[PDB]
Design a binder for these strands. Structure first.
Lengths: 172, 171, 171, 172
DNA sequence: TAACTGTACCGACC
DNA sequence: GGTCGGTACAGTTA
DNA sequence: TAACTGTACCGACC
DNA sequence: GGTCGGTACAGTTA
């Protein structure tokens, strides 16, 4: 009967719709049906509530990346899954959370797996043309991830598939 | 003008912290003015935010005009877009671009820029060359946002190199 | 109930000062509670003011039940109106009655007393009896407001003599 | 010229229609089309603006009282004017000021004429029938002055005259 | 017995 | 003239 | 030399 | 996230 995960989904859904500044116990109570004491029961500070949201979303993204990877040892094969989940499996909440995370080490740490085991390493890229060609993909996937929140002019699915394919065809 | 100075301080303030802790009070510190003198200049919070959207939107239209010496070709515009995104737009611009949907006034302030300098998505599905330019656009947005969504700041050396590689890609 | 002790302190504050300077902070000083403890109990200012109106309008109704010994007739209600106006109603009720038009909720809290106890102003051009009762109502009202609009508080004895004079005048 | 009496009149009219707590430099600037600076020139503080208003209205009244007293030796004649100018020639502003007056020595003092040279005397009426029947009249007049602001039942012009006549008939 | 809900407060801040 | 993030603890429902 | 207007700024309170 | 009561001038209009 523990509604601890349901609260987080509700909180994530809420920040997509509205935003972080406006997420508070009262407004999460209103949205969960729960009472404020109820929420405090699982998340005794706002800091825990946010941690849980970061953790929850980083774990969605890790599970998503590992599932769609055909072979986990092939670098290019995992870069392809980074490109794909960035174009389809991450939305507004993740972006707001990525941006909020630097604001506390706890939140940074919650994202360490998926920023250190899936995003390609920046090493001597000044003078390595292949490595820099692998980073160009990463940069382009990141632009397709944030595109609809920064351009005010959403891509339709069809345009987004077309651009996803273009970022893929560019994998070495 | 005292107005532009206050707005400049508010922009650095949000780069360092966020919109949500931008308050008349926290802004009175950073600017040295009293909470009340601040309100004299920006009589509501919405005005203060409208100021900041407008200042940044304008600065962006400025720098990308002082950088293209041929406004004609979508390609020279496109060059201007990549460089400004790569090297002279930071965290505050990203913060206000995210926040902009929350009021029509905010959207309206970026309207000039967001459609005038931004390549056209229009028929992208069938035009390979139009997908080659949007790929550049996307890579630029990638470098613009890079350090604020991966816990890893690029060094100036790395950043310059990725700018070039993107600059290469240009049709 | 803690609500009722809070209203009671607010009633005495406005007796000493005014409604205009009655604020959550100034009522927190006077009650011992914190600003937000008070807001827990009355969540908006409207609610606090509605509470004070309700409380006085209802004490006056009660104080005018254990005094009138035959709710039946116009005259025994009038005697009661006169006595309560003369001696168990002071500056807070005057202040609240002046403020009460500022909102329908407040007027409404004074319905029971304002018509059901106070004699009617109806049919008063032509009925001598009805003018002799309203004369008594005006005098009672005059004694009620006396200390607060004339720079001269009456003593208890002066007040009883006058009370008694209005009471004689009863048709 | 000098807008000074004109500002006070506007301020009086303002609070009649609205009230005292809302009367401010800003709101009085709007009502007068003057500037806050303009108002502060005549009235260096709000205190000085309320006194102006207390002073002005007590003189309108004192003027009105002696304007309508035929024989000012006669204690019953002045009692008649009191009643008359109470039932006919004072309105809301006048009530709000009276009620506010005791909150400051200057305000009390500005009402000293009309309260001393005109209001009959509470002097051993405990044992004196005539004196107390003179107070009764004063008492009913005060009641007709406050009626409309205390009872939520504005009297018609006609009923107000009817009641005024009745208090007057109660005279010597 | 864990998962709540309600009630009464309060300091920093908007 | 409030909100917001707590804190404290008693009383109820799966 | 008086009666304003506008512009910037602030502490206490709401 | 503000209003209310100023303070402090410099310039303007009769």
């Amino acid at each position: 009967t523990s509604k601890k995960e349901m609260i987080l989904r509700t909180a994530i859904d809420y920040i997509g719709e509205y935003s972080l500044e406006t997420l508070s116990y009262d407004s999460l109570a209103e949205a969960t049906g729960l009472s404020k004491s109820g929420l405090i029961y699982h998340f005794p500070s706002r800091h825990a509530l946010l941690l849980g949201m970061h953790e929850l979303l980083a774990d969605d993204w890790d599970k998503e990346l590992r599932d769609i990877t055909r072979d986990p040892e092939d670098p290019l094969e995992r870069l392809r899954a980074v490109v794909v989940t960035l174009a389809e499996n991450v939305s507004r909440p993740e972006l707001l959370l990525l941006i909020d995370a630097p604001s506390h080490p706890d939140f940074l740490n919650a994202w360490r797996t998926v920023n250190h085991q899936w995003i390609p390493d920046t090493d001597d890229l000044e003078n390595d043309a292949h490595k820099r060609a692998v980073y160009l993909v990463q940069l382009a996937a990141d632009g397709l991830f944030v595109h609809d929140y920064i351009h005010d002019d959403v891509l339709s699915k069809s345009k987004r598939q077309a651009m996803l394919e273009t970022i893929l065809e560019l994998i070495p």
